[PDB]
Amino acid sequence: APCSCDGDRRVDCSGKGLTAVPEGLSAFTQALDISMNNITQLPEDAFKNFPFLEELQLAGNDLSFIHPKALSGLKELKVLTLQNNQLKTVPSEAIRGLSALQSLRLDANHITSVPEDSFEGLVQLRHLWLDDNSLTEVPVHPLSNLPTLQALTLALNKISSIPDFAFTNLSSLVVLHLHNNKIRSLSQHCFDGLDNLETLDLNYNNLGEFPQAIKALPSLKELGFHSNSISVIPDGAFDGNPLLRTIHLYDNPLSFVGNSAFHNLSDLHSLVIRGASMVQQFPNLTGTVHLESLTLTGTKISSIPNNLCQEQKMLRTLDLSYNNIRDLPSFNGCHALEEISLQRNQIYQIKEGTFQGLISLRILDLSRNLIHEIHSRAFATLGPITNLDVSFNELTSFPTEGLNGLNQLKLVGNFKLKEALAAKDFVNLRSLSVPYAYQCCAFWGSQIIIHCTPSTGAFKPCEYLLGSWMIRLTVWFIFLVALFFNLLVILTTFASCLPSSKLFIGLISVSNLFMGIYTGILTFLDAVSWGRFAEFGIWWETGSGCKVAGFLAVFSSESAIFLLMLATVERSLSANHLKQFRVAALLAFLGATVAGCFPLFHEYSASPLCLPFPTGSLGFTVTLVLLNSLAFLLMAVIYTKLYCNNSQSSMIKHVAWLIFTNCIFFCPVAFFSFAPLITAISISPEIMKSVTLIFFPLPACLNPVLYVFFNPKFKEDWKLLK
Secondary structure, three states: OOOOEOOOOEEEOOOOOOOOOOOOOOOOOOEEEOOOOOOOOOOOOOOOOOOOOOEEEOOOOOOOOOOOOOOOOOOOOOEEEOOOOOOOEOOOOOOOOOOOOOEEEOOOOOOOEOOOOOOOOOOOOOEEEOOOOOOOOOOHHHHOOOOOOOEEEOOOOOOOEEOOOOOOOOOOOOEEEOOOOOOOEEOOOOOOOOOOOOEEEOOOOOOOOOOHHHHHOOOOOEEEOOOOOOOEEOOOOOOOOOOOOOEEOOOOOOOEEOOOOOOOOOOOOOOEEEOOOOOOOOOOOOOOOOOOEEEEEOOOOOEOOOOHHHHOOOOOEEEOOOOOOOEOOOOOOOOOOOEEOOOOOOOOEEOHHHHOOOOOOOEEEOOOOOOOEEOOOHHHOOOOOOEEEOOOOOOOOOOOOOOOOOOEEEOOOOOOOOOOOOOOOOOOOOEOOOOOHHHHHHHOOOOOOOOOOOOOOOOOOOOOOOOOOOHHHHHHHHHHHHHHHHHHHHHHHOOOOOOOOHHHHHHHHHHHHHHHHHHHHHHHHHHHOOOOOHHHHHHHHOOOHHHHHHHHHHHHHHOOOOOOOOOOOOOHHHOOOHHHHHHOOOOOHHHHHHHHHOOOOOOOOOOOOOOOOOOOOOOHHHHHHHHHHHHHHHHHHHHHHHHOOOHHHHHHHHHHHHHHHHHHHHHHHHHHHOHHHHOOOOOOHHHHHHHHHHOOOOHHHHHHHHHHHOOHHHHHHHHHOO
């Protein structure tokens, strides 16, 4: 086939790379399609062989120059297309005989300018396209020869401004597109004569002032000018546009908006305003009763008018975030509204009648406010609510009537909400997020799974504080032994009436007795609250008892590591000083106090075991660990010198055993104290909590044991005591 064909008397020579006009075709060819080839010019009477031509298509052909008699002879074709070409100037002297055109597609061309005598004889054209071009000005004079043009596009060009009386002859214009353009300014009377204009396009431009000249476009129904540089919509700017019904103005530096500028718009269907910070009061909405959305964000208004919902009967979406509203009105008569999103405001209270008559509500966003009280019956009138977001407020008690269908609930940030909510009034709940991890223990941490957020575990226990009945029974002996044997050592040491060795041993017995007092407090708490801990956990962690428990635990643990680093400096120094060793044993019992009194003011609240480093803030924990490690290193370094260096032989043996036991028993706690750094090969918190719970009070359990059944001076002093 010289050239691919079809059965509707049409030749479709696409995809062939012709270098000339096809020949030998039928004289009855209805449409000549020769697109996507490589011909650059046509001789005269190139299309004389086709007297009955209607649809000529040579787009994507890359024409360069046209002979001013080649296209002649076509006195009856309809649509001419020459896009994706490189025509520098319009065939103005060649389109004179093209008197039967209906659409001239000269877009996607290299047109830089049109001549004055263009568009003559085209009295039947309907569509004009000059898109993706390089025209510097609007062709006013040539456009004057188009009295019946129906749709004109002038976008993607290099025009900077449109002068006055530049569009009078286009009496049948209906579509005007000027997007991705550079025009900056326009005159008062530039747009006159377009009485039939219905859709106007000006977006993606740079007009710095409101195009007030739109007062003469009565038939405008779509108005898009978004992504511009406008900052004030004046007062009364849409008087001449009553049939208008869709405004586009988003992404602009709108700073101020007039109070009565949005009135008498009966066909408006949407309204979005974000960033008008200079607006102080709610706009006048008289005459606009068919609107479906009000998105007023970034504004300083303070009071919702008390009758929007008796006038806007078709409202569906209400978004008033990022405002300064303080008082909320009655929402009765808002039947079709389903998208209330009042957030980032200054509302402080919710009344009974605030949310009455809302039968179609489905979304609520009352977060980031200062609501301190909510009525019990407030939510009893609502219908099929699904989302309720009240997080990050100042609530103390949460009503529960009429919230059985809440699919998703959010409550985080209400720190003063101590009361624990029940699981009977939220049977149809899918996602919950509460202020304290122990309020989640009542939804179980059937068919579907809730997903609580502050998450429970073993360092935030939900039934037992200690663990199984093995960690329980061993903490009960470490308490009994550390109490009774320490009391016995104190009694025999400080009631025989001392040298500077015996006094130090008695003081390390006092600081072990206080540690035993701390672990006893822990086991009584576990015992009282057996079988349930949610009831007592909130009262314990946010209470004041945890402060005393932590004070005793840290004080007993660091007053016995500095009273054993001063007892190695009294043996190395026997290789005089009764006064000084007695005034340095007060500065060890008062230096210890500072550390505990300290975490009490600046923490003891990240575990129920009330310690500072079971887990680890990167403050007190790392400092305690570093100080204890250096003291133990120096303690061994000092004794190492004495190691290489009667009653003196018996005391040396006792202090060496004390230092070995205390060094050995401390390594598990130090090693597992750095849990986040190494995760202990993804060790379970339950397992490591156990070992940091048993092995921590252990050293202050055999110090008075080792000393009472294996040291010569305990026998003698016992006998001088009877």
